[PDB]
Amino acid sequence: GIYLVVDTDIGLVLLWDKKTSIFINLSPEFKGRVCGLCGNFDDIAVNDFATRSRSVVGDVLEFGNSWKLSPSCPDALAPKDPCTANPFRKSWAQKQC
Amino acid sequence: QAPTLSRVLMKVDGVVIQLTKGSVLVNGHPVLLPFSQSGVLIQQSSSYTKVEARLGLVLMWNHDDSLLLELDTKYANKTCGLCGDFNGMPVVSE
Numbered sequence: 001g002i003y004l005v006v007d008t009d010i011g012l013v014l015l016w017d018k019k020t021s022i023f024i025n026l027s028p029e030f031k032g033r034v035c036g037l038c039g040n041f042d043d044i045a046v047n048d049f050a051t052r053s054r055s056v057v058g059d060v061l062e063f064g065n066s067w068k069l070s071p072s073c074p075d076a077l078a079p080k081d082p083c084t085a086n087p088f089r090k091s092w093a094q095k096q097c
Numbered sequence: 098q099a100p101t102l103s104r105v106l107m108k109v110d111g112v113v114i115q116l117t118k119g120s121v122l123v124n125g126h127p128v129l130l131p132f133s134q135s136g137v138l139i140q141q142s143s144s145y146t147k148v149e150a151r152l153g154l155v156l157m158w159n160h161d162d163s164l165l166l167e168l169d170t171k172y173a174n175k176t177c178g179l180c181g182d183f184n185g186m187p188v189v190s191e
């Protein structure tokens with residue numbers, strides 16, 4: 001279809017739409033063994049914000065910035081409201097969505 | 098109160114038009130007629146204020162305090178309000 005499927009023998013599957021979208025399928029053999037921006041796979045969604053330092057935080061920005069590969073990379077800041085910074089698009093967006 | 102018309106509020110594809118006696122506001126900003134923007138044309142004549150929307154509507158606020166709306170036939174069976182559901186049958190569905 002519109003998807004490119006990367007299949008692995010370890011139980012991990014990837015679907016990529018050749019664009020910003022990516023879907024990662026994990027077998028139930030990796031529960032509690034994974035980490036990163038995708039959570040830790042232990043059926044609990046509130047502790048998925050665990051940082052690289054192994055601490056669950058309430059700030060999404062801090063949890064996301066803790067997972068950057070390069071420590072020298074600048075931290076991400078809070079973005080503006082897309083429909084407030086660009087109101088002239090807002091109507092179209094709604095009419096499109 | 099005479100049964101005068103005080104305010105007419107129009108939402109036309111993201112454009113907000115407020116018509117009051119001696120005032121026309123577009124998106125909260127007073128405008129000078131004729132005013133064309135985003136496919137909406139507002140113009141004042143000796144007897145009426147006309148708002149034409151290219152999506153297919155015409156609104157007339159006359160000086161005898163009459164508000165007349167004319168709609169494109171593509172909106173039939175898809176409207177609601179004091180003007181009915183626009184399906185060609187007077188009583189049913191209203």
Ligand SMILES: [Ca+2]
Nearest residue numbers: 042044047048
């Ligand atoms: Ca979890």
